[PDB]
Amino acid sequence: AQYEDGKQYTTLEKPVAGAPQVLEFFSFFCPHCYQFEEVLHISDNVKKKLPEGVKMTKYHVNFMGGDLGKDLTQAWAVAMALGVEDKVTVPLFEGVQKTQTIRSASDIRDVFINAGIKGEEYDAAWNSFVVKSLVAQQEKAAADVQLRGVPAMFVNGKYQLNPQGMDTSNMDVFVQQYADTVKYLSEK
Numbered sequence: 001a002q003y004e005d006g007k008q009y010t011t012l013e014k015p016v017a018g019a020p021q022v023l024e025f026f027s028f029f030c031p032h033c034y035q036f037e038e039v040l041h042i043s044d045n046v047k048k049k050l051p052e053g054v055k056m057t058k059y060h061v062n063f064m065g066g067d068l069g070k071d072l073t074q075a076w077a078v079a080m081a082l083g084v085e086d087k088v089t090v091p092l093f094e095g096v097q098k099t100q101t102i103r104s105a106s107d108i109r110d111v112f113i114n115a116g117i118k119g120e121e122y123d124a125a126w127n128s129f130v131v132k133s134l135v136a137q138q139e140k141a142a143a144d145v146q147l148r149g150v151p152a153m154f155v156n157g158k159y160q161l162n163p164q165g166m167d168t169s170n171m172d173v174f175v176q177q178y179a180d181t182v183k184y185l186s187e188k
């Protein structure tokens with residue numbers, strides 16, 4: 001077959017029930033995730049190939065960056081609660097990996113302030129129990145699939161993308177086949 005279990009994707013031994021249709025995990029400390037987001041724009045290219053209105057979920061992970069890595073998961077929960085993901089994704093990636101000016105929770109907060117999020121607005125969400133639940137959601141999702149590495153993408157909580165089975169000769173070709181695989185899986 002053109003698509004085969006173990007080539008472009010893998011099947012989860014224990015399927016996860018009720019998971020998001022398309023769920024990808026990432027870390028602002030993850031170098032591959034930087035390439036995925038800023039150079040390849042994988043998520044946006046996957047979204048453009050799925051049926052309009054499909055649910056695309058993106059969660060941060062804890063297992064990179066120790067203390068800061070957990071602050072970034074809470075900061076991503078803040079971004080999700082306020083709906084400012086598209087405003088802080090770039091500066092956070094570059095703050096951590098390009099300029100390396102993000103070394104504390106306050107430095108993370110600076111990115112939101114510079115992005116236009118009001119100070120009181122950010123601090124209220126940071127300490128809100130809505131955000132604490134969003135943090136638990138992200139952790140539960142990663143735990144459900146026994147996530148040990150990022151970047152990663154799962155489809156309907158049963159199939160896991162295998163980026164190792166694609167050609168990296170061409171930036172655009174790699175993205176296209178990745179997105180086509182997600183489409184194929186979502187139609188399974």
Ligand SMILES: COc1cccc(-c2ccc3c(CC(=O)O)c(-c4cccc(C(=O)O)c4)oc3c2)c1
Nearest residue numbers: 032035039149150151152163164168169170171174
């Ligand atoms: C077209 O030019 C470019 C320009 C910028 C980046 C890339 C590029 C190429 C190859 C990969 C691979 C697979 C591999 O390492 O073989 C991964 C990856 C993804 C998720 C998890 C893991 C893991 O194993 O944890 C690895 O990300 C890649 C990114 C290519």
